[PDB]
DNA sequence: CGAACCTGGTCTTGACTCCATTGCCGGATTTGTATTAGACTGGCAGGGTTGCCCCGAAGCGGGCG
C-alpha cells in the first residue's frame, strides 16, 4: 500500500498458483510481470530455483 | 288647553378640494443578438481497504453429433 499510488498484491490462490493482481482488476500470475519488467524464463529459474 | 320654544336629529344641496388614473411622451436602462481572420485539433487523475447474504453472470472442465 503506497500513499496516493496504486496498489499491487501477490496472493498465493487456492491452487499452488500465484495472482499478481496490480490495481483492483483481475488477477495474474507473476511470470507476466516478471518478463513485464524484463525478466527472462532462466533469469526466474534463477531468482526462484 | 294652547303658545311659543329649542333641540333630538334627518336629509338634502351646492360649492370646493383632492386625488387617483390613464395617456402620452421622451429619455434611461435593460436584455437580447451578432461579431470579432495568424494558429491553435482527442479530458484530468482520482480514489480505496466491512462483513455478510442472495443472486445472477462469465468461464472452465466435461463429454458428445
Known amino acids: 500500500i503506497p500513499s496516493r499510488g496504486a496498489w499491487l498484491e501477490f496472493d498465493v490462490d ?11 482488476k ?14 527472462t524464463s532462466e533469469q526466474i529459474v534463477e531468482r526462484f530455483g
Not at 14 to 24: E, L, M, P, Q, Y
Not at 26 to 39: F, N, Y
Open 14 to 24: 487456492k491452487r499452488d498458483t500465484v495472482g499478481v493482481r496490480i490495481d483492483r
Open 26 to 39: 483481475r488477477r495474474q500470475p507473476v511470470t507476466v510481470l516478471l518478463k513485464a519488467l524484463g525478466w
